[PDB]
Ligand binder design. Structure first.
Ligand code: MG
Ligand code: MG
Ligand code: MG
Ligand code: MG
Ligand code: MG
Ligand code: MG
Ligand code: MG
Ligand code: MG
Ligand code: MG
Ligand code: MG
Lengths: 138, 83, 94, 91
RNA sequence: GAGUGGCGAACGGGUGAGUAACACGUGGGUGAUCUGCCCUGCACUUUGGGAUAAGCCUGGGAAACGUCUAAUACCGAAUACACCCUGCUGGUCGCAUGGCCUGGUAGGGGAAAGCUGCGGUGUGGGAUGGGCCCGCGGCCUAUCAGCUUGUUGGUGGGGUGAUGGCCUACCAAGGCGACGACGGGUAGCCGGCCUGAGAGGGUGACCGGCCACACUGGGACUGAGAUACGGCCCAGACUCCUACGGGAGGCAGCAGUGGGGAAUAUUGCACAAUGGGCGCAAGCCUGAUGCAGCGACGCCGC
């Protein structure tokens, strides 16, 4: 399931307020609600701030990296690139947007794919809103 | 049926009639001992112990009676003979 | 009587065995007396065995099964027990 | 070369019990009452429980109201699992 | 090919009827006991005989179940000092019967198999599996208050692998119960699994232990081991074949079929892999098992 401007238009930033920040956080990264539920339940298991771990897990996604990398414009543009398998990780075809890259992960591009290989130094802290989404659940 | 059960039925007729014969022969040996003891007949009963205790432990050597059973018979006959 | 087996603990098309001492009577994934070692989906097969416990159970008279007897002959606990001059030195990983 | 014989190569303890004698009227068997105390799993009262335990006397030494030390056995008879070791106090 | 013979067939797999019990779960005990196969000490594998299937000829019927010849089949003996039984006696250990030192004695007895490298009897030890007792633990009910006579104990015998009223014959008059005996109802038990912050409450699917049962009941035989699923005998209930004289069979194995249900699968492929049985081995069996099909039934991922 992939969702496939207005959905953003309702929220702005293009229980009343609680759901709206989750909604942009979900439809920004292109996640389905069941997958977003899983990253929360992993985040609260991990130590530190439970809200701050959530944004670390969502930023770790391999397609998110492409968006930040800027190899492909529009996070939704990178969905078309990644699943098609243009990208490579440690000499392996990742055809998966849900791949979460760790530290020392080498993302290269496949030969051809003609329409620049940046590396992960660590999983970025929040400095590189969560307390609504934490208080939404539980 | 259908199986090699048909063969192992034929064995259990054969091997029963062997073990039935030996088990029955021990009973008549042990029975005739006690009638000698209850008469007050010492010299006859002393002979019949060595007759029976021979025959008991041979049946253990067959693999019929099992030696612990054969031993506990011989114990009972000897303690009877002493009195 | 007692026998050194393998027991298939893996998921589908991906077996992992652990080298188990057990009775001949028991079902394949049943109760072991002792788990000695472990062991095929690799360029180099992964084989690990306690050398001390293998000598104990073989010294008692635990009969190895046919494919375990290969693994003992490879790692060289069979040649310690048997006392024949082929010795030991095999495996690696990478 | 081998020796024609090998060594066999000990002795776990049976349980003990002490308790006051009741009804020593049956052919050398003494019916001893053993007190036990356990905390009740929920409520946490220490309940005093009891049970009658048929001990083998042999010769009829002890009497009623005596505090007799015991030890376990095989079944000497069905119910009878015990024997007296030593007789403390008297009636 | 079939036939005698040796091992296997008690394992694997199924289902939850029964059972409120030493059945189960955790603890111990066994001076109260068994153990084929396996290995690893020691000592031997001596000597003779008698039969019986197969094969031929008879009867019986649609069907199916009188005379000959071999063996690691079955049997008289001899030898065995380990071993079993009894008598007299030594020392030590202690938890009472008693154990142990192969204690030492002197009486009486115990076995076997051979043919093209595998075996065979006896007896020490080790390992496996069991069996039998007990401590405590775990559902509802007094609109169930008395129950018991082999009942509780003793002595002499029988019996079992083994201790025991386990059984049996005589004396004693005891046992269990308000801490729920004897009854009625429901129930496989557990590691776990769902929930809850916990303590609790519910449930016992898959996966892994132990129990019970194999149309319904009652037996025993063979064996190292039997609730003996695909064994035997008898009695009952039910259903098939029949040329009406006679027979045969039990999916709670895997598929499958019809019912009942709101509802649950293919009359699949293969012994390649792991486990098991037999054989010296090559191998030969394995609906265990490894896989495939089918159903969004569930959990993930695109
Ligand atoms: Mg006796
Ligand atoms: Mg009841
Ligand atoms: Mg046998
Ligand atoms: Mg029921
Ligand atoms: Mg609460
Ligand atoms: Mg029946
Ligand atoms: Mg028998
Ligand atoms: Mg069947
Ligand atoms: Mg059978
Ligand atoms: Mg079926």
């Amino acid at each position: 399931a992939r969702y496939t401007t207005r959905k953003s238009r309702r929220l702005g930033v293009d229980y009343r307020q609680q759901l709206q920040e989750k909604q942009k956080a979900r439809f920004s990264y292109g996640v389905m609600e069941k997958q977003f539920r899983r990253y929360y339940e992993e985040a609260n298991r991990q130590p530190g701030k439970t809200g701050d771990n959530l944004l670390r897990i969502l930023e770790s996604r391999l397609d998110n990296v492409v968006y930040r990398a800027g190899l492909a414009r529009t996070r939704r543009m990178a969905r078309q690139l990644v699943s098609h398998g243009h990208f490579l990780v440690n000499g392996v075809k990742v055809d998966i947007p849900s791949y979460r890259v760790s530290q020392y992960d080498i993302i290269d591009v496949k030969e051809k794919s003609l329409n620049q290989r940046i590396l992960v130094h660590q999983l970025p802290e929040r400095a590189q809103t969560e307390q609504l989404i934490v208080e939404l659940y539980s | 049926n259908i199986k090699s059960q048909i063969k192992r039925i034929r064995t259990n007729e054969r091997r029963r009639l062997r073990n039935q014969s030996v088990k029955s022969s021990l009973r008549t040996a042990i029975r005739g001992f006690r009638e000698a003891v209850d008469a007050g007949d010492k010299d006859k009963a002393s002979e019949l112990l060595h007759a029976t205790s021979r025959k008991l432990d041979k049946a253990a050597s067959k693999g019929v009676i099992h030696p612990n059973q054969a031993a506990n018979k011989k114990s009972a006959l000897a303690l009877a003979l002493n009195k | 009587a007692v026998k050194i087996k393998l027991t298939r603990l893996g998921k589908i098309r991906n077996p992992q065995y652990r080298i188990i001492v057990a009775d001949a009577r028991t079902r394949r994934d049943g109760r072991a007396i002792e788990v000695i070692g472990r062991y095929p989906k690799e360029e180099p097969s992964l084989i690990q065995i306690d050398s001390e416990r293998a000598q104990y159970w073989l010294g008692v008279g635990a009969q190895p099964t046919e494919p375990v007897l290969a693994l003992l002959k490879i790692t060289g606990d069979w040649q310690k027990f048997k006392g024949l001059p082929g010795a030991e030195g095999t495996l690696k990983v990478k | 070369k081998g020796p024609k014989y090998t060594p066999a190569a000990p002795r776990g303890r049976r349980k003990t019990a002490i308790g006051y004698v009741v009804s020593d009227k049956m052919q050398k068997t003494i019916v001893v009452e053993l007190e036990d105390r356990k905390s009740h799993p929920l409520y946490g009262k220490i309940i005093r429980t009891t049970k009658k335990v048929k001990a083998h006397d042999e010769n009829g030494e002890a009497g009623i109201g005596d505090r007799v030390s015991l030890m376990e056995t095989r079944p000497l008879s069905a119910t009878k699992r015990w024997r007296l070791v030593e007789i403390l106090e008297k009636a």
